Amino acid sequence: PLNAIEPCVICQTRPKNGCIVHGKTGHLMACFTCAKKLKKRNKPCPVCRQPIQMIVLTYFP
Amino acid sequence: LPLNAIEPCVICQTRPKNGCIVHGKTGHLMACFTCAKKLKKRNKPCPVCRQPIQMIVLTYFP
Ligand SMILES: [Cl-]
Ligand SMILES: [Cl-]
Ligand SMILES: [Zn+2]
Ligand SMILES: [Zn+2]
Ligand SMILES: [Zn+2]
Ligand SMILES: [Zn+2]
């Protein structure tokens, strides 16, 4: 996934570490800060429009 | 920026890192969904932090 290393598609600054979770699937295209704002404002997933169940701060060990 | 995100699953060394191991509010992404599901199914902890595995999230990269 060559886009995994590109910046947050919302702020184009921070890395993609704000995983938007819904059930057993996640869309990772946004930083924790950007993804938390969406959760806080009760917005859906930007790409699939499923509700945001949680934000997971994603590390690549 | 996490340049290691595009390296393969550290377990099978084949499939991409799309098996996010979730525990509390954090996730360790270093394994494919297949490999991460086997760990969860067999009730193993997170390979790198040993926290219990709450869930595996099949991670897509829009
Ligand atoms: Cl959250
Ligand atoms: Cl699971
Ligand atoms: Zn952002
Ligand atoms: Zn989504
Ligand atoms: Zn694997
Ligand atoms: Zn862990």
Residue numbers in the entry:
A (entry chain DDD): 431 to 491
B (entry chain AAA): 430 to 491
What text does the study give?
The importance of the ubiquitin ligase murine double mutant 2 (MDM2) as a key negative regulator of the tumour suppressor protein p53 has been studied extensively. Second, it promotes the proteasomal degradation of p53 by recruiting Ub conjugating enzyme (E2) thioesterified with ubiquitin (E2~Ub; ~ indicates thioester bond) via its RING domain and mediates ubiquitin (Ub) transfer from E2 to p53,8 where Ub is preferentially conjugated to lysine residues located in the C-terminal lysine rich region of p53.9 Although the relative importance of these mechanisms is context dependent, in vivo mouse studies with ligase defective MDM2 resulted in the same lethality as MDM2 knockout experiments. The RING domain of MDM2 has been discussed as an alternative target to stabilize p53.19 The rationale for this approach lies in MDM2′s ability to still bind and inhibit p53 when MDM2-mediated ubiquitination is abolished, thereby preventing uncontrolled activation of p53.8 The RING domain gains its E3 ligase activity through dimerization with either itself or the RING domain of its catalytic inactive homologue MDMX to form a homodimer or heterodimer, respectively. The dimeric RING domain arrangement is essential for E2~Ub binding and activation as demonstrated by co-crystal structures with UbcH5B–Ub (en dash indicates covalent complex).
Since the G443T substitution produced a stable MDM2h dimer, we wanted to understand its impact on MDM2h’s structure and function. We purified MDM2hGT on a large scale with the aim to crystallize it in complex with UbcH5B–Ub. The structure of MDM2hGT and the orientation of UbcH5B–Ub are indistinguishable from the structure of wild-type MDM2h bound to UbcH5B–Ub, indicating that the point mutation did not affect the ability of the RING domain to recruit UbcH5B–Ub. G443T is located near the UbcH5B binding site and is in proximity to UbcH5B’s K4. However, in all MDM2hGT-UbcH5B–Ub complexes in the asymmetric units of both datasets, the G443T sidechain is not within hydrogen bond distance of UbcH5B’s K4 and in one instance UbcH5B’s K4 sidechain could not be modelled due to poor electron density.
